[PDB]
Every structure is written in structure tokens, then in C-alpha cells.
Symmetry: D2
């Protein structure tokens, strides 16, 4: 089963742009190796990325937002 | 409510797929559960609303205008 | 001199997303054959695309917005 | 006010360049004259504000955070 990557972002914070950018960085790099990348509207200060439910990134844990380079490496780890 | 956009990967339709995804999320925001970008094969470009068909290059022909896409989604909320 | 493509869009209409999408479609297709693609904030109902100042597209003339396929062909005409 | 973002074409940095462009235009809107996406060569990623340097991978190191980019632009308005 190809992996489902989910990017949950705070809607009111206007983090849609950065979420959509990262989604494209992953899909342009991994292409069909990924089942999909979902952009999921979320609440206050939220910004999390999961790989089949497994934690990949969370602003609350890693702090701030992921650099494209790091995000790609972390997904590579799981893929 | 899950919106899914399946696009032909080799056709480099990711760009237009992610554009549409943002047009929907920026417009409907949290009224949408999510918008999934789903890599696909040759000439594919489909959009589903909870599994229901909203757009298909083969049926509707071509690609949707942001205005049309928004209206169809709005019609299903 | 590489060509300057300018995309002027109505700011309050929220047409930035479509302008930025088209800019990427052109730069991903023509790459360095283009000097640049500028996103230019504009006023009410405006959406125009120029190629070195020359008209390429204008909502007021062509009506509506350009399909990626058409925009690419029109730029190809000039390039 | 002209903001220019020059990026390495072959590095496929167009995506991050266009992302930043939108972050600036969606934030500052008409206060900006324009944001130009300028194809470049090997490892280049520079951002100028009317010719003045705002960012350079070689100087600042890496790529800017949306928050940092917005602050520097804000500082020059």
C-alpha cells in the first residue's frame, strides 16, 4: 500500500501556502512512490505531518516549520 | 468532507492540481475535511467529493476553471 | 535579452493564486528561456499578461482566464 | 517596490521561490510593486528589494523562513 502523508495546518494562521508548498515538494520528489498527500485544515497553532499516521513533524515537538531538505529526508526514512 | 484530486504524474499536472487544492482550501477553509493530491497515470485528472464525481477530464473535458470547481464543491456542502 | 513576462492580477479579487500558478507553469516549461515572470498586484477586475510589454492575454479582451495550454502556446509564439 | 527572487533552475528551486513570492504578495499585497521570479544558475538563491540585498544563500546560508522574509521586507517599506 502506497503511503498517505497528511499535513495538518492552522487555517486561521494562513499556513495553507506553506502546507501546499511542502506537499508539492514531496510529490515532485517522490511522485508515485506516495499514495497521496493530504492538506488538512486545522485549529490554532497546529502544523503536523504524518506518514501513515506515524509522526513525521510537529511544530509543538520539532519547533517551527520544516525545511524542504529535512522533510524529504524524514519521508525517505519511512519510505 | 474529503476532496480528492487525482492527476497524471508524468504529464506534470501536479502544479495545476495543487493550485486547485489551494483555491478550494483558501475559499472553503475548515468546511473541508481535506484535499488530497493523488498521483495518477496517463492522462488522468479527476476530482471526487467523498467518492462522488465532481470532475473528470474524460467526462467534462479538459481542466476546470476555479470558478466552476468552487461552484460544484459549494453545491455539495 | 531574455523576455520579461508580467502577470498583473486584481489583488482584492484573490487572483494571486491563479497568477502564481500560471507563472510556475511558464517557468517550469520554458525555464531559462525566460528572463523572468513578474507577479504584479493590480486593481479591480484586472488580469493581464504581457511579453516584453506586448499583449499576450487580457481578461477584458480574451474574456475569462487563460488555460495553461493556451498561455504556453501564446508565449511560444513570441519566443 | 520591486522584489526579485533569483533561483537555481536545475536545482528545482522554482517551487520554493514561487511559494515565497506568494507569501509576500498575500501579506503585503499592493504595497509591493511586484515580485519577479528570475531563473538562475547553479546553487543560486537570492532575493533583492529594489536591487538591495535581502537574502542570499551564500551570505545568510540556506533558505529563508517565511517569517524572516516577511520581517526583512516589512523593514524596508
Amino acid at each position: 500500500h502506497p503511503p498517505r502523508i497528511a499535513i495538518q495546518y492552522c487555517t486561521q494562521c494562513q499556513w495553507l501556502l506553506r502546507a501546499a508548498w511542502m506537499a508539492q515538494e514531496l510529490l515532485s520528489t517522490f511522485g508515485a512512490d506516495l499514495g497521496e498527500v493530504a492538506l488538512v485544515p486545522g485549529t490554532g497553532g497546529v502544523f503536523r505531518i504524518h506518514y501513515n499516521g506515524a509522526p513525521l513533524w510537529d511544530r509543538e515537538v520539532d519547533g517551527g516549520f520544516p525545511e524542504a531538505k529535512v522533510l524529504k529526508q524524514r519521508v525517505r526514512d519511512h519510505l
